[PDB]
Amino acid sequence: VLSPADKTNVKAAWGKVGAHAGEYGAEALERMFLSFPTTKTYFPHFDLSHGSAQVKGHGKKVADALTNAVAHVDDMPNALSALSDLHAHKLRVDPVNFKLLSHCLLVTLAAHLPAEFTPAVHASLDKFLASVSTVLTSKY
Amino acid sequence: VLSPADKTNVKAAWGKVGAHAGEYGAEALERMFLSFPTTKTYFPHFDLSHGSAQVKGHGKKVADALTNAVAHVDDMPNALSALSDLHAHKLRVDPVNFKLLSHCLLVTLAAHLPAEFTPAVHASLDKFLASVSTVLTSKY
Amino acid sequence: VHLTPEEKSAVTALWGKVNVDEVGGEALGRLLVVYPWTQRFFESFGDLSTPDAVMGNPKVKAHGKKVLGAFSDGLAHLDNLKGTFATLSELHCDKLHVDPENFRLLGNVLVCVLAHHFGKEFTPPVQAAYQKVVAGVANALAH
Amino acid sequence: VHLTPEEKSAVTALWGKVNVDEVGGEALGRLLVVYPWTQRFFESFGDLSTPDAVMGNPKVKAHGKKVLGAFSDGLAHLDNLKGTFATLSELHCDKLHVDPENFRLLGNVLVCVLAHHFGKEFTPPVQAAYQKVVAGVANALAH
Ligand code: HEM
Ligand code: HEM
Ligand code: HEM
Ligand code: HEM
C-alpha cells in the first residue's frame, strides 16, 4: 500500500511536527468543523468554539492515534482495530468525513511545515491518511 | 474486512450466477458505458456498441478476475496484484470509476438474480466489490 | 437536467409500473442495511439490528413512501428540480446535516431496487436514463 | 454560491497577495503528483516521471496559469459561477471527459498550496471561505 519512500516521507514529517502534534490535530479539527459544518453533528456535546479545551484535548487524541499508526505503519489494521470499531460501529462515522479530516490534516501540516510539505511528501502524507481512513472505515 | 457471512453470501451469489458470469460482466460493462459515458474514454479502441465481441470478450475477463478474487477471498491483494498494477500504473484508471462499475455489477446481478439479491446479500456484494476496488486502486 | 424524449419515455413507462407503496421502503431499507452509518439518522425508528428487522420495520416502510413521493415529484418536474427540492434541501442540509454523497447512494440503491423488481425490463438504456434522474435529484437536494 | 461579507473579505484580501505566475502551476503540478491518474489527461506535456520533473515542467507551469486565470475569474463572479464556467464545463465534460471529482481534488490541492504559501495567515476561517469558493467552481464546472 505505502511505498518505502512514503514511509520514509511520513516519518520525516512526523519528526519535524514534533511536540506540536497535539496542537496541530486540534487545529485540523477546527478547520474541518468550520469548512465542513456537517461534521459538527458528531460532536453535539463538544463546545467547538475557538480555544475549546475539548477540541484541544481531542486533537491530541487524534494526533496520538496517527502517531501510533506511523509507529506501526506495516500493521495499521491491528494497531487501529479498536479505533476502527469505535468509528464504524459505535459512532457510525460516514466514510466521506474521513476524506474531509484528512484534507484538513494536510492543510494544517502545509500551513506549519513550509520546508517539509514538498509535492513528494504531500503525496506520501495523503496516501498515509487514506490508508488510516481505510482502516477506520473497514468495519463498513 | 469481509465477514464470514459476507464471504458465504458472495460465494452463494457467484454459485447461482454460474456460467452466466461472462455474459453478466459484459452487461455490467455496457451499463457503465451507457450510464457513465466518461468511462468510455478508457476504451477508445473498443467498439462499444451493443453486441460488440470486444465488450463480450472483456466482460468475461472481468468476471474471471472477480471469480479469482472470491476464490482467493482471504488474499485478494496477492491474487489481484497484476491487475492492480495494470489499472493504476499502466491504465491510470481514476478511482471513482471503480465505484461506477461496482454499482453496475450490482445492478446486473439484481436484474438477473431475483431470489439471491436480498438486502443482506446486496450488502455483502457491495463490500466485496469495494474490497476488490481498493486492491485495484492500491497502487495509488 | 434534460432527458431526451427516449430517455423520458424509458423512465415514465417503467415508473408507471412501480408499486409506490413498497419500492420506497425497499430502497430506504436497503440503504440502512448496505450503508449502516445512515442508521445514525433514524435512531427513532426502533429495531434496525438486523436486515430483516430493517426491512420489516413499519417506520422504514412508511418513511420510504415519502422518499418515493419526493422522487415521483422529481420525475414530474425534471426541468425544475432545483425549485422542487428547495425545501427538502433545507431540511436535509441545514437541519438534518446529511452529507450529500448519501443522496447519491440512495439514488443508486433505488436503481438497484428497480433492477431487482423489473429484471430484464431494466435494460442498460433504461438504467442510463434513471441514473440521469437520480443524479438530478441528488444535486437538487445538495444545493 | 454566496459568501458572507467576512467570507468575501477573507478570500479577496488573500487572493491579492497570490503570485498568479506560480500558484496555478504548483497546484496543477501537485495534482499530477498526488493523484497520478490525472496524468492521463496530459500525455502531451512531456516528462512527468518524477515530482521534480512535473513541478519543473514548463508546460505544467504554463498551463497552471490558465487554471488560476479561471479561478480568478471565478472569484470575480461568485454569483454567476454557472455562466462563467459554461464553456470550461463543455470542454472538460464533453470533450475532455474528466470526472468532476477531479475538480474537487484540484480545488482541495489549491487550498493546500495556499496554506503552504501563506502559513499562519491561512487561518481556519480563511480556509472555510476558500472551501466555499473551490466547491462553487467545481460544481459550476460539473454542470
Ligand atoms: C481521520 C483520522 C481519524 C483519527 C486518527 C481519529 C481518531 C480518534 C481518536 C483517537 C478518538 C478517541 C477515542 C477514545 O478516546 O477512545 C476518536 C474519537 C472520536 N472521533 Fe475520531 N478519528 C478520525 C476521524 C474521525 C472523523 C472523520 C470523525 C467525524 C467527522 C470522527 C468522529 C469522532 C467522534 C464523534 C469521537 C468521539 C468523541 C467523544 O465522544 O469524545 N473521527 N477519534
Ligand atoms: C471493478 C472491477 C474491475 C475488474 C475486476 C477489472 C478487471 C480487468 C481485467 C481482468 C482486465 C484484462 C487484463 C488483461 O487482459 O491482462 C482489465 C483490463 C482493463 N480494464 Fe478493468 N477491471 C475493473 C475495473 C475497471 C474500471 C472501473 C475501468 C475504467 C472505467 C477499467 C478499465 C480497463 C481497461 C481500459 C483495460 C484494458 C482493456 C484493453 O486494452 O484490452 N477497469 N480489467
Ligand atoms: C436522495 C434523495 C432523498 C430524498 C428524495 C429524501 C426525501 C425525504 C422526505 C420526503 C422526507 C420527509 C420530509 C417531511 O417529513 O416533510 C425526508 C426526511 C428525512 N430524511 Fe430524507 N431524502 C433523501 C435522502 C436522505 C438520506 C440519504 C438520508 C440519511 C442518510 C436522509 C435522512 C432523512 C431524515 C433523518 C428525515 C427525517 C424525517 C422528518 O424529520 O420528518 N434523507 N427525506
Ligand atoms: C477544477 C477546476 C479546473 C479549472 C478551473 C480548469 C481550467 C482549465 C482551463 C482554463 C483550461 C484551458 C482552456 C483553454 O485552453 O481554452 C483547461 C484545460 C484543460 N484541462 Fe482543466 N480545469 C480544471 C480541472 C481539470 C482537471 C481536474 C483536469 C484533469 C485531471 C483537467 C484537464 C484539462 C485538460 C486535459 C485541458 C487541455 C487544454 C486544452 O485542450 O487547451 N482540468 N482547464
Number of domains in chain B: 1
| Pick from B97, B105, B134, B137: nearest CA to B2 | B134
Residue B41 · residue B110 · CB < 8 Å: no
Binding site feature residues of A for heme b: 87
The answer to whether A36 and C93 are in contact (CB under 8 A) is: no
Helix, strand, or coil here: B38? helix
Alpha carbons C36 and A89: distance in angstroms, whole number: 9
Q: What contacts C14, CB < 8 A, 6 or more positions away?
A: C114, C118, C121, C122, C126, C130
Which of B37, B41, B92 is the closest to D39 by Cβ? B92
Q: How far apart are CA D135 and CA A102, in angstroms?
A: 17
Q: Residue D22 is placed in which grid cell? A: 506560480
Distant-in-sequence, close-in-space partners of D103: CB < 8 Å, separation ≥ 6: D92, D137, D138, D141, D142
| Residues contacting ligand 4 via CB (< 6 Å) | D 38, 41-42, 66-67, 69-71, 88, 92, 96, 98, 102-103, 106-107, 137-138, 141
**Separation of alpha carbons A59 and A111, rounded Å:** 16
d(CA A105, CA A85): 22
**Positive or negative, the Cα torsion across B90, B94, B98, B103?**
negative
Rounded Cα distance between B35 and B44, Å, is: 17
Say which residues have a Cβ less than 8 Å from residue A57's Cβ, sequence separation at least 6. none
**D40 interfaces chain B, CB cutoff of 8 Å:** yes
Closest CA to B1 of B129, B118, B121: B129
For residues D85 and D141, the answer to whether their CB atoms sit within 8 Å is: yes
Å resolution of this model? 2.0
User: C105: nearest CA in chain B?
Assistant: B103
Domain that holds residue A127: 1-140
Instruction: Tell me the CATH number at B35.
Output: 1.10.490.10
What residue type is assigned to position D127 of the chain? Q
Q: Indicate the helix (H) or strand (E) that contains D107.
A: helix D101-118
Q: Which residues contact C124 (CB under 8 A, 6 or more apart)?
A: B27, B30, B31, B34, B35, B50
Q: What are phi and psi of B91, to 5 degrees?
A: -90, -15
Per CB-CB distance under 8 Å, the chain D contacts of A39 are: none
Alpha carbon distance D23, C60 (integer Å): 50
Which candidate from C35, C37, C97 shows the least CB-CB separation from A41? C97
CB contact at 8 A, D71 and D141: no
Among C54, C52, C15, residue whose Cα is nearest residue C31: C54
What is the DSSP secondary-structure string of A84-130?
HHIIIIIS---THHHHHHHHHHHHHHHTT-TTT--HHHHHHHHHHHH
Cβ separation of C97 and A38 shorter than 8 Å?
yes
Catalogue all structural domains in chain C, each as residue range(s) with its CATH number.
1-143 (1.10.490.10)
| C-alpha span between D2 and D15 (Å, rounded) | 17
Distances (CA, A) of A135 to A70, A119, B49: 13, 25, 40
Kindly list the distances between the CA atom of residue B94 and the CA atoms of B39, B85, B91, C65, D36, in Å, as whole numbers in the listed order: 9, 13, 9, 36, 9
By three-state DSSP, how is residue D54 classified? helix
Distance, C-alpha A15 to centroid of its chain: 15
Query: To 10 degrees, the CA torsion angle through D28, D30, D32, D34?
Result: -150
- How many Å apart are CA B78 and CA B63, to the nearest integer? 18
Contact D57/D46 with Cβ under 8 angstroms?
yes
Contact indicator for A126, D34 with CB cutoff of 8 Å: yes
* Cβ proximity of D63 and D28 under 8 Å: yes
For chains A and C, CB pairs below 8 A equal 24
Binding residues of A: 58, 87
Q: How many CA atoms lie within 13 A of B83 on its CB side?
A: 19
Q: What CA–CA distance (Å, rounded) separates B25 from B104?
A: 9
